[PDB]
Amino acid sequence: HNGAPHHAIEEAESLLQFHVATYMDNDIAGQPQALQKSGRPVKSIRARLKGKEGRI
Amino acid sequence: HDSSKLLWATEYIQKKGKPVLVNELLDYLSMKKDDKVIELLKKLDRIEFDPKKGTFKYLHSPSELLKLLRSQVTFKGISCKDLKDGWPQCDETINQLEEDSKILVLRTKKDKTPRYVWYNSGGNLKCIDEEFVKMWENVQLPQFAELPRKLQDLGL
Amino acid sequence: PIDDIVKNLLKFVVRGFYGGSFVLVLDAILFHSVLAEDDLKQLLSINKTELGPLIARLRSDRLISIHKQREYPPNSKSVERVYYYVKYPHAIDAIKWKVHQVVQRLKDDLDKNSEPNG
């Protein structure tokens, strides 16, 4: 809505695409761990079900 | 000098900016009192020399601006230069006959509205609701010749 | 012809419900169909942020399909210009649909109406 440097945009949404991705799964290989303000990773949803201790 | 001294008189005479006595202009500047000075002004439009008494003019209303807007047809985008000297306070009369009656391109409201050749019928018509214009903007264009169907699909 | 009306009509909308500067890029490239991109930039002699967002509308409305007016450079290298080959039909086609949509924002709105039921 406010201008369009059209390469900042191309990164801007490609950022948001990264947040949604790590939200579903923050364990993705070939990608940067999305960390917490403790520097520990973020408990993605996938992480909540993965191994023992998961939901299942 | 010859061309330099004559140019000097037109400089200080245009400071007066009106047809003043040539002898005054030959003495107020105290330099361009030679024969080459007055003749150069007689040959230069910077001091528009009439056959009458000492003339010094350097060739006004939005009406002239109004036609100039229509006189810049198929021509290039003109700035605000011809007004500020010819007609003081261009930016007032730019938006005085606004709504494209006196159209001009405000480059910014910090840069004296550096304009182009602008003249239209409605032109801006900002009275249209911006949200509606945003809603007008909000209409996303679908794809190719299926859109020729899509308009017929949409009832157009 | 109606082609002039087509350009005429383009001016009206681009000046009716658009700002004044919108038509400046219209007329400039309407002078010649296959025009070098700089020529408009040169004659307007304005910045790239005073030209970029205006270029947005020309292709956002698809009114100025800027054809890559490729030329034969003398150095034997890449040469092209944004020559706005206007796609008169397709431009208006969306516009009509665009118009229809705002009418839908009124044709639907007729049910949002006078007498209180809720």
PDB file of C-alpha atoms in Angstrom, chain A residues 6-55:
ATOM      1  CA  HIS A   6       9.995  -4.591  -5.522  1.00  0.00           C
ATOM      2  CA  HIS A   7      12.989  -6.321  -4.088  1.00  0.00           C
ATOM      3  CA  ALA A   8      12.295  -5.405  -0.511  1.00  0.00           C
ATOM      4  CA  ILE A   9       8.828  -6.801  -1.165  1.00  0.00           C
ATOM      5  CA  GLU A  10      10.315  -9.930  -2.665  1.00  0.00           C
ATOM      6  CA  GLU A  11      12.200 -10.431   0.570  1.00  0.00           C
ATOM      7  CA  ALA A  12       9.457  -9.106   2.819  1.00  0.00           C
ATOM      8  CA  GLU A  13       6.977 -11.797   1.992  1.00  0.00           C
ATOM      9  CA  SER A  14       9.733 -14.358   1.679  1.00  0.00           C
ATOM     10  CA  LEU A  15      10.333 -13.508   5.298  1.00  0.00           C
ATOM     11  CA  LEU A  16       6.753 -14.105   6.334  1.00  0.00           C
ATOM     12  CA  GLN A  17       6.913 -17.306   4.349  1.00  0.00           C
ATOM     13  CA  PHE A  18       9.716 -18.284   6.671  1.00  0.00           C
ATOM     14  CA  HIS A  19       7.740 -17.585   9.807  1.00  0.00           C
ATOM     15  CA  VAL A  20       4.759 -19.617   8.760  1.00  0.00           C
ATOM     16  CA  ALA A  21       7.103 -22.399   7.764  1.00  0.00           C
ATOM     17  CA  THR A  22       8.896 -22.617  11.058  1.00  0.00           C
ATOM     18  CA  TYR A  23       5.616 -22.284  12.896  1.00  0.00           C
ATOM     19  CA  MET A  24       4.393 -25.507  11.400  1.00  0.00           C
ATOM     20  CA  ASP A  25       7.832 -27.069  11.648  1.00  0.00           C
ATOM     21  CA  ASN A  26      10.907 -25.359  13.061  1.00  0.00           C
ATOM     22  CA  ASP A  27      12.974 -28.489  12.545  1.00  0.00           C
ATOM     23  CA  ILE A  28      13.296 -28.147   8.808  1.00  0.00           C
ATOM     24  CA  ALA A  29      16.622 -29.184   7.377  1.00  0.00           C
ATOM     25  CA  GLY A  30      18.173 -26.854   4.860  1.00  0.00           C
ATOM     26  CA  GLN A  31      16.936 -23.836   6.803  1.00  0.00           C
ATOM     27  CA  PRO A  32      17.835 -21.679   9.807  1.00  0.00           C
ATOM     28  CA  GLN A  33      16.519 -22.620  13.221  1.00  0.00           C
ATOM     29  CA  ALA A  34      14.043 -19.956  14.313  1.00  0.00           C
ATOM     30  CA  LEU A  35      15.252 -19.291  17.799  1.00  0.00           C
ATOM     31  CA  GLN A  36      13.813 -17.909  20.993  1.00  0.00           C
ATOM     32  CA  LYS A  37      14.934 -14.930  22.996  1.00  0.00           C
ATOM     33  CA  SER A  38      16.767 -17.528  25.039  1.00  0.00           C
ATOM     34  CA  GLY A  39      18.477 -18.606  21.850  1.00  0.00           C
ATOM     35  CA  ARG A  40      16.792 -21.975  22.113  1.00  0.00           C
ATOM     36  CA  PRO A  41      14.661 -23.056  19.169  1.00  0.00           C
ATOM     37  CA  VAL A  42      10.942 -22.498  19.035  1.00  0.00           C
ATOM     38  CA  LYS A  43       8.707 -25.404  19.880  1.00  0.00           C
ATOM     39  CA  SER A  44       7.049 -25.844  16.515  1.00  0.00           C
ATOM     40  CA  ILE A  45       3.778 -27.649  16.238  1.00  0.00           C
ATOM     41  CA  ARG A  46       5.471 -30.616  14.658  1.00  0.00           C
ATOM     42  CA  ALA A  47       7.828 -30.732  17.585  1.00  0.00           C
ATOM     43  CA  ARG A  48       4.860 -31.191  19.854  1.00  0.00           C
ATOM     44  CA  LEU A  49       4.001 -34.521  18.288  1.00  0.00           C
ATOM     45  CA  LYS A  50       7.308 -35.857  17.141  1.00  0.00           C
ATOM     46  CA  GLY A  51       8.802 -38.547  19.328  1.00  0.00           C
ATOM     47  CA  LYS A  52       8.097 -39.866  22.731  1.00  0.00           C
ATOM     48  CA  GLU A  53       6.659 -37.106  24.861  1.00  0.00           C
ATOM     49  CA  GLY A  54       4.733 -36.028  21.806  1.00  0.00           C
ATOM     50  CA  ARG A  55       1.023 -36.056  21.753  1.00  0.00           C
TER      51      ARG A  55
END
